[PDB]
Amino acid sequence: QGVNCTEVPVAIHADQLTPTWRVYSTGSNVFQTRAGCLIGAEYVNNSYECDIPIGAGICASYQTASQSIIAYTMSLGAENSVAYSNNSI
Amino acid sequence: AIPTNFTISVTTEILPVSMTKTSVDCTMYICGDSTECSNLLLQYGSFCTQLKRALTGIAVEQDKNTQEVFAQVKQIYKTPPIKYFGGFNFSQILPDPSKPSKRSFIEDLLFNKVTLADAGFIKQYGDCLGDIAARDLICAQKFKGLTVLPPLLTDEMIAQYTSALLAGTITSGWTFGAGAALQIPFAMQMAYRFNGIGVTQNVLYENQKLIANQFNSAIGKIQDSLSSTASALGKLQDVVNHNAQALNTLVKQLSSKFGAISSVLNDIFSRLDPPEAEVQIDRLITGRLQSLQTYVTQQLIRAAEIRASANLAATKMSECVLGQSKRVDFCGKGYHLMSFPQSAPHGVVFLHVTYVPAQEKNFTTAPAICHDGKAHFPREGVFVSNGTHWFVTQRNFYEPQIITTDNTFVSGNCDVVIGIVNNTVYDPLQPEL
Amino acid sequence: TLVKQLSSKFGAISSVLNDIFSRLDPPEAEVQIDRLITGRLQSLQTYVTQQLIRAAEIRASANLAATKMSECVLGQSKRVDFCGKGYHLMSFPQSAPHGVVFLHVTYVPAQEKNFTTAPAICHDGKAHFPREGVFVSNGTHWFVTQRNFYEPQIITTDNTFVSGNCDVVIGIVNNTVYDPLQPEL
Amino acid sequence: PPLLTDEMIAQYTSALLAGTITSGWTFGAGAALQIPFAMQMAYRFNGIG
Numbered sequence: 001q002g003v004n005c006t007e008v009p010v011a012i013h014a015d016q017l018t019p020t021w022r023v024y025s026t027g028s029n030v031f032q033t034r035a036g037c038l039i040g041a042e043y044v045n046n047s048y049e050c051d052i053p054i055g056a057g058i059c060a061s062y063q064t065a066s067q068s069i070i071a072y073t074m075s076l077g078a079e080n081s082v083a084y085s086n087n088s089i
Numbered sequence: 090a091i092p093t094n095f096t097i098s099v100t101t102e103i104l105p106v107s108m109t110k111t112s113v114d115c116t117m118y119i120c121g122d123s124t125e126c127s128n129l130l131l132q133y134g135s136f137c138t139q140l141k142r143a144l145t146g147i148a149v150e151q152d153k154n155t156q157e158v159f160a161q162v163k164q165i166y167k168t169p170p171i172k173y174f175g176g177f178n179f180s181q182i183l184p185d186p187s188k189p190s191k192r193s194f195i196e197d198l199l200f201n202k203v204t205l206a207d208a209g210f211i212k213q214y215g216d217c218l219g220d221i222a223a224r225d226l227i228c229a230q231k232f233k234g235l236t237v238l239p240p241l242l243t244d245e246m247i248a249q250y251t252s253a254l255l256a257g258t259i260t261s262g263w264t265f266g267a268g269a270a271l272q273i274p275f276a277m278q279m280a281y282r283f284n285g286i287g288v289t290q291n292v293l294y295e296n297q298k299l300i301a302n303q304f305n306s307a308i309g310k311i312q313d314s315l316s317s318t319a320s321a322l323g324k325l326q327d328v329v330n331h332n333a334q335a336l337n338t339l340v341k342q343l344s345s346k347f348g349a350i351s352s353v354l355n356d357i358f359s360r361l362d363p364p365e366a367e368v369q370i371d372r373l374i375t376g377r378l379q380s381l382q383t384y385v386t387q388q389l390i391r392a393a394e395i396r397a398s399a400n401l402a403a404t405k406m407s408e409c410v411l412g413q414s415k416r417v418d419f420c421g422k423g424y425h426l427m428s429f430p431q432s433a434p435h436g437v438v439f440l441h442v443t444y445v446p447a448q449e450k451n452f453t454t455a456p457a458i459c460h461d462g463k464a465h466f467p468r469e470g471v472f473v474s475n476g477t478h479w480f481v482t483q484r485n486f487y488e489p490q491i492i493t494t495d496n497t498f499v500s501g502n503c504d505v506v507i508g509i510v511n512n513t514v515y516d517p518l519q520p521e522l
Numbered sequence: 523t524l525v526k527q528l529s530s531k532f533g534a535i536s537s538v539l540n541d542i543f544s545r546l547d548p549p550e551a552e553v554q555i556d557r558l559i560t561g562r563l564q565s566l567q568t569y570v571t572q573q574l575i576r577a578a579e580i581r582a583s584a585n586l587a588a589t590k591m592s593e594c595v596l597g598q599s600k601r602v603d604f605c606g607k608g609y610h611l612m613s614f615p616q617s618a619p620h621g622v623v624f625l626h627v628t629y630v631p632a633q634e635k636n637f638t639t640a641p642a643i644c645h646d647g648k649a650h651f652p653r654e655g656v657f658v659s660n661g662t663h664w665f666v667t668q669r670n671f672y673e674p675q676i677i678t679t680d681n682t683f684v685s686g687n688c689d690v691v692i693g694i695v696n697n698t699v700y701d702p703l704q705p706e707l
Numbered sequence: 708p709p710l711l712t713d714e715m716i717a718q719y720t721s722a723l724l725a726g727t728i729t730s731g732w733t734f735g736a737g738a739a740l741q742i743p744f745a746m747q748m749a750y751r752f753n754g755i756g
């Protein structure tokens with residue numbers, strides 16, 4: 001969170017960075033959000049209900065063996081246009 | 090005294106529902122790029138864990154407040170393509186599709202008067218990495234560990250919520266807050282709204298054009314008022330001012346010596362040996378920890394006020410937008426008819442439509458009418474007389490009718506009530522036979 | 523957290539009073555004791571402040587609980603979405619550890635049907651308005667029914683009230699009114 | 708010292724009480740309209756059913 005991707009999570013071999021995690025955690029499915037760009041979750045077009053909030057209208061969930069974490073955009077609700085007429089009740 | 094006209098008036102109400110979500114970094118604020126201070130800070134227990142845990146409940150409850158205030162409908166309704174709501178003109182508040190986002194005109198006016206600062210809602214490091222002059226308030230604060238998180242719900246989602254609510258309350262009345270939306274003509278809905286506040290339906294059905302014209306004039310006036318004048322949305326600005334000023338005070342409080350040799354860790358460590366540098370470092374650490382605790386305390390106090398305001402906004406919205414309220418002065422001044430919600434950057438705005446009588450006139454009354462030795466009381470109304478003949482009217486409008494057995498009921502004798510007068514009542518059975 | 527914060531050196535040699543009191547002369551032992559006591563007192567002050575903060579939220583929830591009791595249970599609230607979703611009927615309280623549980627009973631309509639409606643009926647050149655209810659039609663004939671349920675009835679003089687002429691209402695229609703006195707005579 | 712002296716508060720309460728006696732509830736939603744007290748009590752009795 002709070003940083004552009006711009007190759008900086010790798011920070012060259014990750015040995016000069018404060019975290020000591022594997023370089024695999026820095027190279028994976030890359031997605032850019034408004035709250036910082038996320039690593040390790042695939043982006044899907046379809047919209048579901050929010051499960052694990054991320055920020056700026058983006059949610060993540062663990063759904064299908066079950067696949068990896070999927071990041072999508074939350075859906076406010078269904079669609080229903082009321083059949084309004086001026087002589088109908 | 091009984092009125093003759095009435096006036097349709099539209100008012101405004103502003104209520105904050107959320108404040109900015111903030112976060113702090115303990116080590117960067119206290120030590121500031123020094124390994125010795127970082128190693129020594131581990132001996133003070135779990136102060137940083139306490140602060141980081143306390144500064145997250147506020148962030149989550151801001152989103153909780155927004156969700157509980159705005160998300161009150163399971164579906165998203167839309168208006169029909171053909172728009173004619175019985176002569177009323179809602180184009181000033183309906184969403185405009187031929188524009189970025191779906192904000193209406195009133196919302197567009199609102200997001201310019203009070204949006205003085207949108208804050209650093211997660212700005213990238215490359216935005217200000219020392220290039221050009223730069224070094225504004227946001228970038229200087231970020232280098233000390235103070236950051237600002239982005240809200241969960243973007244402005245487009247809030248606009249969609251408000252549009253769905255407004256379309257549902259126009260095209261279905263209040264029936265969409267109980268079960269499923271049920272369509273009904275707008276005129277036959279205003280008939281119910283008038284019938285609720287002690288006024289019959291023939292008052293509306295014979296004065297429809299006047300109602301429409303008054304409503305349109307009021308909505309034009311309320312549109313002009315926000316654009317002009319001082320733009321009284323001040324309660325939405327005080328929160329931003331308080332947050333920014335508290336952050337500025339926290340930043341400025343970093344230069345205090347706290348009764349030490351210097352206010353910078355590196356100079357103290359360079360100019361003194363550890364045996365005597367320990368006391369100075371301890372003094373600085375405890376001073377900065379006490380400085381940091383008070384900010385958390387004040388934020389935790391202000392969160393309660395924001396939560397109370399959000400709860401009041403949710404209650405008002407549920408009880409006034411989704412239905413008519415009989416509580417006095419809860420939603421506007423006068424007799425409540427119906428209200429519309431609008432969005433604000435950190436709050437909500439209501440446009441209450443009320444009913445105000447006018448043009449009263451003088452009369453004389455009588456509790457009963459002793460005819461044929463019996464006291465006749467009005468079934469629903471009041472006895473009045475202009476000086477020769479007696480009539481039965483309503484209480485909120487002048488509409489005289491002849492005294493009849495249909496709209497009067499007999500009870501007891503006419504020798505016990507103090508102010509009885511003498512008159513005759515006409516039975517409709519006699520004239521036809 | 524308050525218990526665990528008792529094992530912090532706070533810059534002293536050790537977090538044990540007995541160890542510091544021994545092994546050292548009074549002039550420096552008292553300095554270490556003051557250093558420990560300052561932290562061990564400010565932590566307790568912080569805990570007291572946090573508890574005093576939480577008490578206000580608990581009271582603000584208790585007031586709402588009492589109001590809901592007095593309004594939903596001891597009566598029947600008419601304010602929307604206060605005592606449950608839908609039209610309120612009754613409530614039953616239940617007791618839970620450090621709280622209270624309400625069982626709101628409501629009323630929701632289920633099955634709808636389309637209709638055509640009119641604002642008034644001009645029979646003898648006079649507009650007739652419903653006393654309480656609506657005018658609906660199933661295609662050929664006209665009825666009058668209440669709003670929240672479907673129960674059609676014939677239009678009569680004791681069910682509608684006249685007002686003015688029928689050249690002002692925008693969408694008036696034509697029909698007939700029973701006038702039940704006439705057939706009996 | 709407080710902004711509003713006790714005399715002003717007493718004046719406010721007196722105005723409210725005189726209004727609610729001489730005009731019922733109509734003075735809180737527009738202009739005050741006179742009405743005899745007995746008829747106002749009858750209206751309130753109708754209000755409580």
Ligand SMILES: *[C@@H]1O[C@H](CO)[C@@H](O[C@@H]2O[C@H](CO)[C@@H](O)[C@H](O)[C@H]2NC(C)=O)[C@H](O)[C@H]1NC(C)=O
Nearest residue numbers: 092093094095096298299300302303447448487
């Ligand atoms: C009640 O008020 C309405 C409007 O406030 C009055 O209608 C106005 O009548 C005057 C008479 O010349 C016209 O000039 C105005 O144009 C009318 N108003 C509008 C909006 O067009 C009506 O007369 C009032 N009723 C009584 C009994 O005084």
Ligand SMILES: *[C@@H]1O[C@H](CO)[C@@H](O[C@@H]2O[C@H](CO)[C@@H](O)[C@H](O)[C@H]2NC(C)=O)[C@H](O)[C@H]1NC(C)=O
Nearest residue numbers: 172173176177178179180181182194305309312
């Ligand atoms: C509803 O009100 C709007 C005003 O906001 C009307 O739009 C104006 O219409 C007139 C004539 O059609 C134009 O001269 C103005 O320029 C319009 N104003 C704007 C801001 O576009 C609209 O016509 C009204 N609705 C109806 C049905 O007349």
Ligand SMILES: *[C@@H]1O[C@H](CO)[C@@H](O[C@@H]2O[C@H](CO)[C@@H](O)[C@H](O)[C@H]2NC(C)=O)[C@H](O)[C@H]1NC(C)=O
Nearest residue numbers: 473474475476477478479480481488489490491
């Ligand atoms: C009080 O109102 C009544 C009801 O309109 C008036 O009675 C009628 O007044 C009109 C006005 O010119 C006369 O043409 C009618 O002949 C009156 N009706 C009857 C049965 O006589 C009454 O005049 C009004 N009183 C005053 C003092 O104006």
Ligand SMILES: *[C@@H]1O[C@H](CO)[C@@H](O[C@@H]2O[C@H](CO)[C@@H](O)[C@H](O)[C@H]2NC(C)=O)[C@H](O)[C@H]1NC(C)=O
Nearest residue numbers: 454455456505506507508509510743744745746
């Ligand atoms: C209408 O008001 C007048 C003015 O107060 C009433 O006259 C008073 O009646 C009471 C009743 O016994 C007397 O005690 C007062 O002395 C009367 N006033 C004066 C100045 O003498 C009148 O009774 C009222 N009308 C009704 C029907 O009660």
Ligand SMILES: *[C@@H]1O[C@H](CO)[C@@H](O[C@@H]2O[C@H](CO)[C@@H](O)[C@H](O)[C@H]2NC(C)=O)[C@H](O)[C@H]1NC(C)=O
Nearest residue numbers: 458459460461462503504507508509510511512
């Ligand atoms: C209304 O009419 C009745 C009867 O027509 C009046 O009652 C009479 O009042 C006088 C008072 O001088 C008595 O002497 C009579 O005995 C009463 N009639 C009966 C049948 O007992 C009554 O006063 C009238 N009310 C008003 C306000 O004029």
Ligand SMILES: *[C@@H]1O[C@H](CO)[C@@H](O[C@@H]2O[C@H](CO)[C@@H](O)[C@H](O)[C@H]2NC(C)=O)[C@H](O)[C@H]1NC(C)=O
Nearest residue numbers: 658659660661662663664665666673674675676
């Ligand atoms: C509309 O409703 C009316 C009354 O419910 C119907 O009229 C009756 O229809 C039944 C058919 O089941 C006949 O047996 C009766 O003789 C009819 N009554 C009269 C007075 O004609 C009418 O058929 C309904 N129309 C539609 C299209 O459903």
Ligand SMILES: *[C@@H]1O[C@H](CO)[C@@H](O[C@@H]2O[C@H](CO)[C@@H](O)[C@H](O)[C@H]2NC(C)=O)[C@H](O)[C@H]1NC(C)=O
Nearest residue numbers: 643644645646647648688689693694695696697
């Ligand atoms: C409702 O019924 C009335 C009375 O039968 C209709 O009024 C007459 O309609 C005819 C039809 O063209 C006209 O020639 C007459 O001039 C009307 N009478 C008057 C006094 O104007 C009325 O048209 C009917 N409503 C509808 C919608 O047809």
Ligand SMILES: *[C@@H]1O[C@H](CO)[C@@H](O)[C@H](O)[C@H]1NC(C)=O
Nearest residue numbers: 004005006032213214215216
């Ligand atoms: C930041 O990320 C965006 C992706 O939205 C990219 O276009 C841009 O080049 C990155 N770097 C900077 C400095 O903005």
Ligand SMILES: *[C@@H]1O[C@H](CO)[C@@H](O)[C@H](O)[C@H]1NC(C)=O
Nearest residue numbers: 043044045046047071072073
């Ligand atoms: C998914 O969305 C992207 C942009 O958000 C778009 O380019 C792409 O065509 C979409 N694909 C489908 C299958 O909707």
Ligand SMILES: *[C@@H]1O[C@H](CO)[C@@H](O)[C@H](O)[C@H]1NC(C)=O
Nearest residue numbers: 085086087171173175176692
């Ligand atoms: C009512 O609706 C019909 C069809 O949509 C339309 O022709 C008619 O003009 C509408 N009524 C008014 C008063 O415009």
Ligand SMILES: *[C@@H]1O[C@H](CO)[C@@H](O)[C@H](O)[C@H]1NC(C)=O
Nearest residue numbers: 090091448449450451452741
């Ligand atoms: C009613 O009468 C009183 C006293 O005669 C007078 O002061 C008052 O103005 C009158 N009401 C109106 C609306 O004129």
Ligand SMILES: *[C@@H]1O[C@H](CO)[C@@H](O)[C@H](O)[C@H]1NC(C)=O
Nearest residue numbers: 082083088633634635636637
């Ligand atoms: C009424 O008819 C419209 C179309 O004419 C339809 O969309 C709507 O579902 C109908 N009402 C109900 C309750 O089914």
